[PDB]
Amino acid sequence: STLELLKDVHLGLPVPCHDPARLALLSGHYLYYHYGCDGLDDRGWGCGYRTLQTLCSWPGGQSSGVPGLPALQGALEAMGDKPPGFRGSRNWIGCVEASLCLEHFGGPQGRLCHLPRGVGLRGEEERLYSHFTTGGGPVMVGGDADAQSKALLGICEGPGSEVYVLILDPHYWGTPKNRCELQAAGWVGWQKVKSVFDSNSFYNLCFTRL
């Protein structure tokens, strides 16, 4: 009768440092949306929608008001952001579309941020700490130029301020049994910012707040 998705899947993960100097995790709850999780086969193109659905699930960790992919595409058509025929298409979306859909469906507020080429998080480290500390939600990372949408759920750093971010990857295909399975395979996990955000690429972020 109901869509049974996994909740708060990062819980139980070890800190990626021996002695973290700073650590901030999101508050509130979210669900793990991923390829095909609702029966629609969006492999290869749907991951931006899946990350967006995760954002929509926060902070209640509830699926009941989270739109499906067709409804998301239909909203973009209705708003004039995409041409007729977009609904039913296999077109990808990113942070720009996500921010528009958040507003349309009354989801958390979605604030855009562009990261150009540069070191680390390009100066946005402090914003990310403050964001999570002040009740911020999952941060979408667009899938442009790497073909992988991701959500950011936390941030920490070691003694030398090498930063790690807690990443949620929506590319799982199948039915994940539990959060331990996701953690063991790295579908959710801490990663060094240097590896998540290639210094020679651009990234878009969409911060969620409520």
Are 141 and 205 spatial neighbours (Cβ–Cβ below 8 Å)?
yes
Which member of 17, 29, 113, 171 is catalytic?
A: 171
- Return d(Cα 55, Cα 104) in angstroms, integer: 14
17 is catalytic: no
169 is catalytic: yes
Beta bridge mates, 25: 154
- Return d(Cα 126, Cα 157) in angstroms, integer: 11
Q: Pick from 135, 123, 128: which is nearest to 151 by CA?
A: 128
In degrees rounded to 5, what are phi and psi of residue 5?
Answer: -95, 155
The interaxial angle of helices 69-78 and 47-56, nearest 10 deg, is: 90
Resolution (A): 1.7
Query: Which domains are assigned to the chain?
Result: 1-210 (3.90.70.130)
- Return d(Cα 3, Cα 45) in angstroms, integer: 22
Using CA atoms, how far residue 172 sits from 21, 51, 55, in Å, is 32, 12, 17
Token readout for 113 is: 């941020």
SS3 of residue 31 by DSSP: strand
In order, the DSSP letters of 120-177 are TTTT-HHHHHHHHHTT---EEE--TTTS--EEEEEEEE-TT--EEEEEE-----S---
Which member of 47, 56, 95, 156 is catalytic?
A: 47
